[PDB]
């Protein structure tokens, strides 16, 4: 009854909630699908009760009457005076990363060269370049601008999956979930790391993150980040220092979202569940963290520092905001469960 049914994307995240459900006591269950869309589906047919989810997914499964419940809060310079759980979501910069080394590339030059995604429909990693993209160009054939990307969540066989890698084995190449080598935030940032591709789509914090001996994770061990440039919207290139001058546009946080009729219950418990997992939790470093996953951002992101309540008791639509809102609906001009 008072227990709740967390959607897990691909069998990493299953296998870190599979260890929150037996620390939780059963108050917290685990379902398990093989992409996000599945995920919400599951979540609709009340199967599941809630996952995490990027702006872009909020946007599709809000079409579909679920509603965010609480947003992902990370530590923040301004605003100090209030508890984590009640203070207002800043929002993260979305960048468009390059290496230094590959002198003269621009956002001007874009056209014709190699990209890594965080995955088809995401915030940054793809509904904002191409959203950007689509319009400078007067063009809906955003699969012909790139000569071949990794895009999770695209048709395999095209060049927007051209780059992706699959997993150990070579086996589900651009799935979106974490088996794919190249998704999400940290795989689009790895995929430039190794020169897979020219440019990455990812937010501020993953270069951050990643870099100056942040990861520890063998491609990531000896990346230094003044072997990096973002990629102003003026055709200039600045360092990774100047994001707040240099970005596509800052997003809204990942949230948690339920079916509008579990909503209360579900915030209920996942209050209770961080006070014991969260940040500075009951139980965090002893036992089990929420938001730890070795910066691979299962099930919530790494740097969260805890779930926030939202206030003013958001609709999906002001939840996202106006000028984010206008920016999907016109990129899906170009290309249930298809609720609306
Ligand atoms: C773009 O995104 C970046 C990345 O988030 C934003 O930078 C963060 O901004 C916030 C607020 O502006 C900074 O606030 C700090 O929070 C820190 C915790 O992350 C506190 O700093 C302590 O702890 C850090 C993490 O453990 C640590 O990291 C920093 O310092 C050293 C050297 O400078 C380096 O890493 C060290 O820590 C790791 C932990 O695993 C350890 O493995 C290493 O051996 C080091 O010990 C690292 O390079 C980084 O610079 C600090 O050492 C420090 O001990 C601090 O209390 C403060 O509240 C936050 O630090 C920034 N994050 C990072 C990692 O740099 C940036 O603001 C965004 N830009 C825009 C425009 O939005
Ligand atoms: C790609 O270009 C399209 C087409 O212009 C952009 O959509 C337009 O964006 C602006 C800014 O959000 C919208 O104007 C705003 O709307 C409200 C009411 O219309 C107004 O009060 C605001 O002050 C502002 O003027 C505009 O409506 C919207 N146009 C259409 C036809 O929907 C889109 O944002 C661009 N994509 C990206 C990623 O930049
Ligand atoms: C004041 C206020 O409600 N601000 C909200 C903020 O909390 C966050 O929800 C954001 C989502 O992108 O939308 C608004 O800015
Ligand atoms: C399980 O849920 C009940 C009801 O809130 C609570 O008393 C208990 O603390 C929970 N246990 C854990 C470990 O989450
Ligand atoms: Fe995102
Ligand atoms: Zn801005
Ligand atoms: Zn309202």
Same mark, same amino acid.
């Given at each position: 009854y008072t227990r709740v049914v967390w959607c897990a994307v691909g069998p990493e995240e299953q296998k870190?909630? @599979?260890q929150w459900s037996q620390q939780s006591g059963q108050n917290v269950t685990?379902?398990?699908?093989?992409?996000?869309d599945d995920c919400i589906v599951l979540v609709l047919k009340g199967e599941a009760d809630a996952l995490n989810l990027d702006g872009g997914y909020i946007y599709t499964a809000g079409?579909?009457?679920? +509603?965010? =419940?609480?947003? &992902?809060?990370?530590?923040?310079?301004?605003?100090?005076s209030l508890d984590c759980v009640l203070r207002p979501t800043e929002g993260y910069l979305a960048v468009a990363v390059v290496k230094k080394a590959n002198e003269?590339?621009?956002? /001007?030059?874009?056209? !014709? *060269?190699?990209?890594?995604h965080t995955a088809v429909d995401?915030?940054?990693?793809?509904?904002?370049?191409?959203? $950007?993209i689509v319009n400078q160009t007067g063009s809906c054939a955003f699969d012909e601008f790139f000569s %071949?990307?990794?895009a999770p969540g695209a048709d395999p066989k095209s060049r927007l999956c051209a780059l992706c890698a699959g997993d150990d084995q070579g086996l589900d190449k651009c799935v979106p979930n974490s088996k794919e080598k190249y998704y999400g935030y940290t795989g689009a940032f790895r995929c430039?790391? &190794?020169? =897979?591709?020219? =440019?990455?789509? =990812? *937010?501020?914090?993953? +270069?951050? &993150?990643?870099? /100056?001996?942040?990861?520890?994770? !063998?491609?990531? *061990?000896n990346l230094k980040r003044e072997d990096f440039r973002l990629l102003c919207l003026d055709g200039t290139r600045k360092p990774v220092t100047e994001a707040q001058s240099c970005h596509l546009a800052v997003a809204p946080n990942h949230a948690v979202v339920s079916r509008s009729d579990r909503a209360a219950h579900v915030e209920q418990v996942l209050l209770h @569940? %961080?006070? $014991?997992?969260? *940040?500075?939790?009951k139980n965090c470093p002893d036992k089990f963290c929420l938001f730890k996953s070795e910066t691979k951002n299962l099930l919530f992101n790494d740097n969260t520092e805890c779930l926030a309540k939202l206030g003013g008791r958001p609709t999906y639509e002001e939840y996202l905001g106006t000028e984010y809102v206008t920016a999907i609906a016109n990129l899906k001009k170009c290309s249930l469960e298809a609720c609306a």
């Open positions: 870190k909630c @599979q685990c379902a398990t699908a093989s992409t996000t079409k579909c009457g679920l +509603v965010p =419940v609480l947003a &992902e809060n990370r530590k923040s310079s301004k605003h100090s003269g590339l621009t956002w /001007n030059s874009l056209k !014709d *060269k190699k990209s890594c995401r915030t940054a990693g793809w509904n904002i370049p191409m959203g $950007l %071949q990307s990794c430039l790391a &190794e020169d =897979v591709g020219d =440019v990455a789509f =990812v *937010k501020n914090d993953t +270069v951050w &993150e990643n870099t /100056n001996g942040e990861s520890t994770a !063998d491609w990531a *061990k @569940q %961080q006070a $014991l997992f969260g *940040k500075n939790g």
